Amino acid sequence: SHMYLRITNIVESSFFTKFIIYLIVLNGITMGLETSKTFMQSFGVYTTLFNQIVITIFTIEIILRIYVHRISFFKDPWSLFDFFVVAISLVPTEILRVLRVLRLFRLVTAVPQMRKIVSALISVIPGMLSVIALMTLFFYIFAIMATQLFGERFPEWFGTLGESFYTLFQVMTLESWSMGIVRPLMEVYPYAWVFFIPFIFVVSFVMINLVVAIIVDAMAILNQKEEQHIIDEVQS
Amino acid sequence: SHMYLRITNIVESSFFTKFIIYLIVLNGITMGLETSKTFMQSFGVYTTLFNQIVITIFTIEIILRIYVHRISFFKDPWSLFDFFVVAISLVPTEILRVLRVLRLFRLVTAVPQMRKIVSALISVIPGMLSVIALMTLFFYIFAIMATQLFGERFPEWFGTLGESFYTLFQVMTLESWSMGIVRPLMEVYPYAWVFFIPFIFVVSFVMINLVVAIIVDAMAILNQKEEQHIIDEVQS
Amino acid sequence: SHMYLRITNIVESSFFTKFIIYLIVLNGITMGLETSKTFMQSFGVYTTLFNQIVITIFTIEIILRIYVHRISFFKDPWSLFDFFVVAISLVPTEILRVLRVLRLFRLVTAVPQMRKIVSALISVIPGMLSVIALMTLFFYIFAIMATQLFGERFPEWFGTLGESFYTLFQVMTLESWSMGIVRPLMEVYPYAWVFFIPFIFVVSFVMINLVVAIIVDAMAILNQKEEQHIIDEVQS
Amino acid sequence: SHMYLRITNIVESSFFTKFIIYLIVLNGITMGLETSKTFMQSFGVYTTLFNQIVITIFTIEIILRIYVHRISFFKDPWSLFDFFVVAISLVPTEILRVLRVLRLFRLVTAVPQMRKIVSALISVIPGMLSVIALMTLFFYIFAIMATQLFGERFPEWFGTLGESFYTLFQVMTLESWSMGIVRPLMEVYPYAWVFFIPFIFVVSFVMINLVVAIIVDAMAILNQKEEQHIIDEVQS
Numbered sequence: 001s002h003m004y005l006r007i008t009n010i011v012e013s014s015f016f017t018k019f020i021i022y023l024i025v026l027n028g029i030t031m032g033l034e035t036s037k038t039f040m041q042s043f044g045v046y047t048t049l050f051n052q053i054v055i056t057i058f059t060i061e062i063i064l065r066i067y068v069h070r071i072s073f074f075k076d077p078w079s080l081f082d083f084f085v086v087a088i089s090l091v092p093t094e095i096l097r098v099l100r101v102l103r104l105f106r107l108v109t110a111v112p113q114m115r116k117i118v119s120a121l122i123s124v125i126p127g128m129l130s131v132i133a134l135m136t137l138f139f140y141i142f143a144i145m146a147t148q149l150f151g152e153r154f155p156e157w158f159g160t161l162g163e164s165f166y167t168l169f170q171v172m173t174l175e176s177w178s179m180g181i182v183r184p185l186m187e188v189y190p191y192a193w194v195f196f197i198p199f200i201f202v203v204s205f206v207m208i209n210l211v212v213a214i215i216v217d218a219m220a221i222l223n224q225k226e227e228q229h230i231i232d233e234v235q236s
Numbered sequence: 237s238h239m240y241l242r243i244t245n246i247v248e249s250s251f252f253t254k255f256i257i258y259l260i261v262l263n264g265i266t267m268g269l270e271t272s273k274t275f276m277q278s279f280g281v282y283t284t285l286f287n288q289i290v291i292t293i294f295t296i297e298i299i300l301r302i303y304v305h306r307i308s309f310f311k312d313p314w315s316l317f318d319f320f321v322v323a324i325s326l327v328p329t330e331i332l333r334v335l336r337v338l339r340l341f342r343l344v345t346a347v348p349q350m351r352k353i354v355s356a357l358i359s360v361i362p363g364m365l366s367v368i369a370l371m372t373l374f375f376y377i378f379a380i381m382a383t384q385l386f387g388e389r390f391p392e393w394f395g396t397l398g399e400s401f402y403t404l405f406q407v408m409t410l411e412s413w414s415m416g417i418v419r420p421l422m423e424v425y426p427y428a429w430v431f432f433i434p435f436i437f438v439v440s441f442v443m444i445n446l447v448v449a450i451i452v453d454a455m456a457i458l459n460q461k462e463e464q465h466i467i468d469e470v471q472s
Numbered sequence: 473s474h475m476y477l478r479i480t481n482i483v484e485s486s487f488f489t490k491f492i493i494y495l496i497v498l499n500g501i502t503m504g505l506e507t508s509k510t511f512m513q514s515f516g517v518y519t520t521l522f523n524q525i526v527i528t529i530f531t532i533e534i535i536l537r538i539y540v541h542r543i544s545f546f547k548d549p550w551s552l553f554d555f556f557v558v559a560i561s562l563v564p565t566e567i568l569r570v571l572r573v574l575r576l577f578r579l580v581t582a583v584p585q586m587r588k589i590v591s592a593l594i595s596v597i598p599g600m601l602s603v604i605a606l607m608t609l610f611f612y613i614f615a616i617m618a619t620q621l622f623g624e625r626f627p628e629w630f631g632t633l634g635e636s637f638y639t640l641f642q643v644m645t646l647e648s649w650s651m652g653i654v655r656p657l658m659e660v661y662p663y664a665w666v667f668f669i670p671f672i673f674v675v676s677f678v679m680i681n682l683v684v685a686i687i688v689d690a691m692a693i694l695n696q697k698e699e700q701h702i703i704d705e706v707q708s
Numbered sequence: 709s710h711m712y713l714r715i716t717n718i719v720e721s722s723f724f725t726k727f728i729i730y731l732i733v734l735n736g737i738t739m740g741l742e743t744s745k746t747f748m749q750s751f752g753v754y755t756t757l758f759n760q761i762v763i764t765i766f767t768i769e770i771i772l773r774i775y776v777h778r779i780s781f782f783k784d785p786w787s788l789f790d791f792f793v794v795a796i797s798l799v800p801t802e803i804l805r806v807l808r809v810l811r812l813f814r815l816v817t818a819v820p821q822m823r824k825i826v827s828a829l830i831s832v833i834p835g836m837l838s839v840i841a842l843m844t845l846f847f848y849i850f851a852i853m854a855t856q857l858f859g860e861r862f863p864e865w866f867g868t869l870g871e872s873f874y875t876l877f878q879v880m881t882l883e884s885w886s887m888g889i890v891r892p893l894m895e896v897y898p899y900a901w902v903f904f905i906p907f908i909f910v911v912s913f914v915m916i917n918l919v920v921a922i923i924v925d926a927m928a929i930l931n932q933k934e935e936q937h938i939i940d941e942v943q944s
């Protein structure tokens with residue numbers, strides 16, 4: 001258990017984390033530069049090796065962090081991320097070559113301020129799941145109806161449940177929903193608007209109400225906590 | 237009144253509701269699958285019967301639920317929905333064939349968490365009705381003016397009160413409002429912008445103010461309830 | 473002063489207001505119907521007279537309301553509106569023929585619930601004026617720069633301060649800002665994005681902050697009022 | 709130190725500030741007018757001199773304000789702005805000719821109400837910096853992936869990290885994201901949607917959560933301050 005503390009003091013040291021971050025930033029610049037064909041024609045060889053080096057150092061770092069953290073490591077979402085993303089970069093040189101750039105998100109996992117933002121942002125999601133489920137069901141149903149109503153005459157937009165899903169998502173963002181989709185549809189189906197206006201109403205109303213209910217239920221909790229605090233003093 | 241309790245204990249049983257939901261989910265998968273011509277060519281016959289079965293079971297379920305709930309059933313919005321949607325699926329094999337997929341919304345009526353979301357979301361609507369009335373009047377008036385101003389030269393977009401309504405709704409979502417509608421209009425009516433900018437201002441200002449007044453009047457009520465609670469202790 | 477009370481009791485009577493509203497709604501239907509060339513070919517003559525009648529009754533009503541309310545009438549925004557809108561409908565049979573439909577907004581002036589909505593919605597505006605002034609200055613400045621930078625090569629979108637104003641408003645609503653304006657601009661002015669991205673950032677940031685500051689300064693006032701209430705009891 | 713107070717009483721006088729503002733507004737009108745080729749053909753000479761005069765007066769004003777405020781001047785963001793913007797207008801008659809119009813923002817620096825708005829609006833930014841950093845990293849990463857995935861076949865939209873950045877910004881504003889970018893992409897890359905839908909989800913979710921967290925953390929502070937106030941009285 002000597003070498004253990006020895007490594008642990010490295011793995012936990014301020015310097016170690018700083019080094020890794022330094023590499024993250026270095027490699028991030030490198031991956032931008034590798035985007036230029038010009039740059040690659042001249043320095044591609046060097047950069048490719050720098051990637052291999054960084055990826056080796058990260059593998060080593062993951063290995064050390066597992067030895068130090070043991071099981072706790074795989075119960076830690078940030079370390080899992082670091083793990084999965086380094087592992088991707090390990091598969092021998094398709095889509096995976098491009099997914100190697102995901103290692104730059106380690107800058108989030110390695111910077112405490114970033115973690116906190118991401119954690120804060122993510123933390124709202126658990127309470128949204130049933131509204132998401134509801135909307136997903138809503139899309140599913142509409143997608144099925146839209147495939148049946150319009151897929152024969154408008155196969156690109158609705159020929160298939162998946163295409164209908166896609167188009168409905170496009171309608172929800174309001175992108176070209178009328179000039180691009182519903183007006184062409186109405187040239188064959190004069191009542192297409194009876195399908196898409198209500199669809200647009202639900203989806204936009206649900207989105208707004210989701211934002212409203214977050215703010216207001218938040219403040220209600222702030223109000224409750226305050227109330228208890230005030231009540232205690234009055235009680236006391 | 238024996239058979240009544242007998243049925244009631246079925247209709248109210250955990251298992252019964254679970255079965256029905258199980259069917260809802262089963263049939264939901266089925267209706268997705270029926271979307272593939274491939275899938276239908278092979279298994280269409282089986283699926284069509286599964287639909288008939290599910291629809292029979294649901295009819296039976298509605299009948300039992302009415303016998304058990306009696307009048308209370310038709311005073312219950314969820315049961316009415318379940319009723320209307322199963323009934324649609326009953327009309328003999330137009331639009332109605334597609335509206336059969338609406339039976340998948342029974343997953344909302346049958347899942348308590350879904351009910352609560354939908355109830356919460358719906359509950360804001362009663363207080364919005366006069367703002368909706370106001371906006372509807374606003375559209376109506378603008379639609380009439382737009383038909384008169386532009387319908388002769390731009391019949392597709394404004395030739396008819398209903399087309400003007402449609403286009404105005406499109407303008408409100410901001411979809412291609414300028415490149416698609418107002419710039420072409422301005423090639424004949426240089427002052428078309430004097431009609432649509434203000435229109436855009438009202439409608440977007442009303443939408444935002446509607447969201448603002450929901451949040452803030454909500455918190456004011458939270459503030460009032462808190463105040464009373466605090467005051468009582470101070471009074472006591 | 474007898475006939476005065478006599479008229480006043482009419483003008484103030486529940487029935488009188490109800491009659492006028494009844495006409496507003498009647499005439500509103502009529503103006504929709506007059507939108508159909510079919511309908512006009514058959515009943516245009518009758519409708520035209522019904523408009524004249526309604527407009528006469530409204531003139532009479534305004535006259536009575538002035539005699540009853542005297543000066544107070546012209547200090548009342550709703551009555552001024554009713555006045556200006558009936559007056560428009562008086563100018564002998566251009567744009568004015570279409571502005572006659574504005575008389576249907578009297579349904580707002582005559583329905584107390586509508587007044588309250590409109591008053592509530594309008595009431596936020598006084599505090600927005602300096603932000604509006606700021607943004608207007610912002611547009612003005614950008615419009616001038618955009619005219620100078622792009623008006624020679626892109627006259628339709630920027631050839632004139634007014635066209636630049638229009639296009640900038642379009643950019644603010646995000647309507648086709650890239651595919652329709654900035655990408656074409658960038659084919660001649662590769663750095664057009666340095667002008668429009670920041671412009672888009674300011675305008676969207678100002679809009680959001682305007683909404684945020686309304687909600688939060690509202691709640692701060694709600695908080696202050698509550699505080700005082702609670703403090704008094706504690707003081708007492 | 710006599711002439712110092714002499715000047716200081718000028719530079720600080722109500723009249724001086726009023727004069728400068730008067731010029732700002734005058735020159736603002738002038739710069740609008742200079743936008744018309746017609747207007748310039750007739751009065752361009754006069755206007756050009758009026759610009760030179762105003763710019764001289766402003767230079768003089770800056771010089772006096774520095775003599776009066778000394779070092780404090782260059783520690784003052786508003787004066788720095790006034791400085792930088794007048795200085796631009798000094799470079800001898802490219803882009804700089806157009807940037808001279810930026811001097812009209814001195815109306816903001818010189819009007820206390822405007823300052824306060826701008827200060828209020830700006831004040832939220834310090835707390836947003838890490839979320840901005842996060843998003844910027846997010847764009848950077850996506851931009852790199854999009855360049856690699858799509859730049860060869862779609863060079864205008866993704867051929868270069870900078871073009872990908874631009875397109876991704878366009879996608880974030882939702883402008884033609886589907887009809888204009890992703891549907892064309894999907895004709896070659898059927899799974900392009902797996903890249904852009906999630907991208908759209910993150911960016912819109914982060915934007916909304918940023919607004920939500922501003923409102924709610926604001927109210928939490930309002931709640932805390934109120935609590936302390938109430939607690940003191942109870943304590944007292």
Ligand SMILES: CCCCCCCCCCCCCC(=O)OC[C@H](COP(=O)(O)OCC[N+](C)(C)C)OC(=O)CCCCCCCCCCCCC
Pocket residue numbers: 125131132135136139160161162163165166167169207210894898899901905
């Ligand atoms: C607050 C409310 C937010 C909204 C909640 C969710 C709303 C629905 C989102 C739908 C997303 C759009 C899905 C989509 O684009 O289609 C994906 C596939 C279609 O696959 P495909 O057949 O390949 O067609 C793609 C187009 N094509 C033919 C030209 C290649 O079809 C599918 O299989 C996708 C089925 C839906 C899966 C995604 C829905 C659940 C994920 C929810 C995300 C929230 C997590 C934070």
Ligand SMILES: CCCCCCCCCCCCCC(=O)OC[C@H](COP(=O)(O)OCC[N+](C)(C)C)OC(=O)CCCCCCCCCCCCC
Pocket residue numbers: 186190191193197361367368371372375396397398399401402403405443446
């Ligand atoms: C918070 C504010 C939200 C906004 C409140 C409402 C704003 C106004 C919504 C207007 C909805 C758009 C209506 C529309 O698209 O036109 C429907 C018909 C026109 O029928 P049509 O003559 O068939 O023309 C359709 C286009 N065409 C010719 C190519 C087939 O013309 C009509 O007859 C429709 C008349 C209006 C009916 C809908 C307005 C009342 C429902 C409000 C929904 C709120 C409930 C939650």
Ligand SMILES: CCCCCCCCCCCCCC(=O)OC[C@H](COP(=O)(O)OCC[N+](C)(C)C)OC(=O)CCCCCCCCCCCCC
Pocket residue numbers: 422426427429433597603604607608611632633634635637638639641679682
């Ligand atoms: C919360 C922030 C909200 C934003 C605050 C205001 C932002 C700026 C709004 C600008 C509105 C757009 C103005 C516009 O479209 O151009 C109007 C004229 C141009 O006249 P024109 O030369 O006829 O060109 C029109 C296009 N054309 C050549 C094809 C016919 O050019 C002008 O003369 C208009 C000059 C601006 C006047 C409107 C700005 C002050 C009104 C603010 C409204 C708020 C009141 C609630």
Ligand SMILES: CCCCCCCCCCCCCC(=O)OC[C@H](COP(=O)(O)OCC[N+](C)(C)C)OC(=O)CCCCCCCCCCCCC
Pocket residue numbers: 658662663665669833839840843844847868869870871873874875877915918
């Ligand atoms: C609340 C979340 C808000 C979002 C936070 C930031 C999100 C990312 C914003 C990205 C802005 C878009 C940048 C952009 O359009 O590209 C600029 C250059 C590309 O240069 P370039 O190679 O010239 O290509 C331009 C297009 N072209 C080829 C046809 C001329 O590529 C670059 O070099 C730009 C690299 C990014 C710089 C801007 C990001 C940091 C500034 C954040 C602003 C917030 C301050 C309040």
